[PDB]
């Protein structure tokens, strides 16, 4: 029984699954770039701030054993 | 938040924390 | 080559129309004739038309009713309309 | 009926339509100071109109 | 786009690129009428440009050639 | 708890009646992110320092070092929150949050258990020789250091959750990745110069690559997803067209989600490890974290790079394996904690917000929302899954999930930050 009922079910929501990703935006250039941008600045924020003080603190810290 | 009644001031938590550093940064470092 | 479909409608009309009756809605241009819209929609969607009802507004615009066969599929048509 | 529209009287009677609209506010902004609604609006009980 | 490449086309291109043109601008005019995300005047602006001049450089090959 | 007595015996943080203003907001979180990363270069106090705790799938997830003051780092609130969405969210109990009563129940359960896995987490490791210890009188000591570290931790979290900017846990994961990287790439034993220097020199460069290809790709991929959001309209501005919309975060409801599904497979080859030098194995055969076929190989998570890839099967297993517990999660996710189908009801309706082409009702909208939910639910999760997954075995820095992850929780909080960042020109004051 249970085969079938996947079956006609898998059918039935692979076709919703379709509508949807037409309703997504679609990825082209300046949507990318925008993200991208944005993004990467933020990352590189937070990324420096913890080389700076981790590195430098650990020679120090470490050494003070 | 909950229903709590008993509440803390940020400035407790952020020190109880800066407490904790000092302590075992000189604790475990030197054993001052 | 024929084509005289300026865009679908969206409209909750519409939705009873796709879903339901197995219809289309069109917007079409201001002077027009039934046999025009029939088989410019039938080459342009990939269709086959079973009906066209159409009727002119007072907006300054036409409206089309077209009916589709059902080895055919409002739908899938309507989806990719207007769509990204 | 009413007798009766022709094909291209109810283009007539949809350019009538759309001059009842007040102006939208995006003209106004852009004549910087401003642009009064200006008589072309129109009742049905009022309105007797020659062609 | 350019008017260089129109003419660079054979006529069989001008054609095939006429149809691809419309049925694009047909899709764009969809999607401003169930609002789009943000304003462009470009979609419709731009491929109606683009239909114009295709046709334009087309038919004046047509006159020479007949 | 549960139930309105223990629930007040739980003491909160309060909420606020300072100022929220950009730099404000940034002055709290800053103050976390410091002392995240500072916690990380101090060492336990049991005359000897620098003992570390084996593992090698802990590391990642949590974002946290392992021997400091915050070697349990983030897996309480992640352990918990696990439990909680298994159950409230297959409808077992009935907790969903709605009222400010099935609400301060969800949030006080939740907060306890974070306090109860402190403890938990820490003896169990000691209690299976992690660090070695495996006397009373040291094992007592260090325990204490632990749990106590964590235990400041959940606090922190709700000080960034309600005063600096975004959630808790969202800040330390993209925190501790970005780390992660920029110290790897950029540090004393950094990347970029053992690239650099090879290509330099005129030999290969396919083992000083391979981190650096593996983080593009995992971008490229998260970026991309980012652009693709399901634009709801709103009200005519009194012209022609539906101007404005509200967007759906595609990657939110298998974001939190994946995050829970990652740290299940790691309390399953924690436990397996952990019970046969404390127990009998009884789930699988662990020694080094993993195996070489069976049950145990199949339900490991290689971070950085693999070659156990080698094996079929055990790509196969695996990828389905994160993908179906993804799924599970998911749906649960609609359910209980954000993204409802319930919330989201009232919500457009009160503001009366339409669709073009009259759709001024209710149910008209509301249906299209209940309808479309299921499908980009799921398929929100098979993708994420996947990604994930491939993105590990590859190898990238951070591990594959960790860029994924870091990526979109710092974009959509990038996005909230830069509408505080330009409220702050004006005098009003920003909080947005």
Known sequence: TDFNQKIEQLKEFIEECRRVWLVLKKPTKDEYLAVAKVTALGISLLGIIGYIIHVPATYIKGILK | ?32 | ?84 | ?51 | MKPSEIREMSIEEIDAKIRELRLQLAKERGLLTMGTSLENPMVIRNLRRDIARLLTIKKEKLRERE | ?432
């Not at chain 4, 001059?19 to 401003?34: A, D, E, G, L, Y």
């Not at chain 6, 436990?271 to 789930?283: E, S």
């Open chain 6, 1 to 432: 708890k549960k139930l309105i007595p223990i629930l007040e015996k739980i003491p909160e943080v309060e909420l606020p009646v300072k100022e929220i203003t950009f730099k404000e907001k940034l002055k709290w979180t800053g103050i976390v992110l410091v002392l995240y990363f500072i916690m990380g270069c101090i060492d336990v106090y049991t005359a000897g320092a620098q003992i570390p705790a084996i593992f090698e799938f802990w590391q990642t997830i949590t974002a946290s070092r392992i021997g400091t003051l915050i070697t349990l780092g983030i897996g309480p609130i992640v352990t918990a929150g696990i439990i909680m969405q298994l159950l409230v969210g297959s409808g077992i109990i009935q907790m969903d949050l709605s009222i400010p009563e099935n609400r301060a129940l969800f949030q006080g359960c939740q907060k306890l258990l974070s306090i109860i896995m402190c403890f938990v987490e820490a003896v169990l490791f000691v209690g299976a020789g992690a660090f070695g210890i495996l006397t009373p009188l040291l094992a007592f000591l260090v325990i204490i250091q632990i749990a106590f570290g964590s235990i400041i931790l959940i606090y922190l979290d709700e000080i960034v959750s309600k005063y600096g900017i975004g959630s808790g846990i969202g800040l330390f994961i993209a925190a501790g990745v970005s780390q992660t990287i920029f110290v790897g790439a950029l540090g004393p034993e950094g990347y970029l110069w053992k690239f650099l220097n090879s290509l330099i020199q005129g030999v290969p460069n396919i083992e000083y690559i391979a981190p650096i290809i593996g983080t593009i790709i995992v971008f490229l991929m998260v970026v991309y997803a980012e652009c693709m959001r399901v634009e709801i309209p709103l009200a005519h501005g009194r012209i022609k067209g539906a101007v404005g919309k509200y967007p759906i975060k595609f990657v939110y409801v298998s974001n939190i989600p994946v995050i829970l599904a990652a740290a299940l497979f790691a309390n399953i080859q924690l436990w397996g490890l952990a019970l046969y030098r404390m127990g009998i194995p009884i789930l699988g055969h662990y020694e080094g974290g993993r195996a070489v076929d069976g049950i145990a190989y199949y339900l490991s998570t290689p971070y950085g790079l693999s070659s156990v890839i080698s094996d079929p099967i055990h790509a196969i297993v695996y990828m389905i394996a994160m993908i179906i517990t993804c799924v599970m999660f998911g749906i649960f996710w609609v359910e209980t904690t954000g993204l409802d189908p319930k919330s989201m009801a009232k919500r457009i309706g009160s503001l009366g917000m339409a669709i073009k082409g009259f759709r001024k009702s209710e149910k008209a909208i509301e249906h299209r929302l209940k309808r479309y939910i299921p499908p980009l639910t799921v398929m929100s999760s098979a993708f994420v899954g996947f990604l994930a997954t491939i993105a590990n075995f590859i190898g990238a820095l951070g591990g594959g999930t960790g860029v994924l992850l870091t990526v979109s929780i710092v974009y959509r909080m990038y996005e909230q930050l830069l509408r505080e960042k330009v409220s702050e020109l004006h005098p009003a004051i920003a909080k947005l």
């Open chain 4, 1 to 51: 009926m009413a007798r009766n529209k022709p094909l291209a009287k109810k283009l007539r009677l949809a350019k009538a339509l759309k001059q009842n609209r007040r102006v939208p506010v995006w003209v106004i902004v852009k004549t910087n100071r401003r642009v009064l609604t200006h008589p072309k609006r129109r009742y049905w009980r009022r309105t007797k109109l020659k062609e």
């Open chain 2, 1 to 32: 938040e909950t229903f709590s009644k008993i509440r803390v001031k940020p400035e407790h938590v952020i020190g109880v924390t800066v407490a904790f550093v000092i302590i075992e940064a000189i604790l475990t470092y030197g054993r001052f």
């Open chain 3, 1 to 84: 080559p024929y084509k005289v479909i300026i865009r679908p409608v969206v409209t909750e009309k519409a939705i009873s129309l796709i879903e339901k009756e197995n219809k289309l809605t069109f917007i079409v241009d201001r002077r027009a004739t039934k046999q025009d819209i029939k088989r410019a929609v039938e080459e342009i969607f990939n269709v086959k038309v079973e009906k066209v009802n159409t009727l002119i507004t007072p907006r300054g615009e036409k409206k089309a009713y077209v009916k589709l066969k059902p080895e055919y599929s409002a739908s899938e048509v309507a989806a990719r309309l207007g769509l990204f």
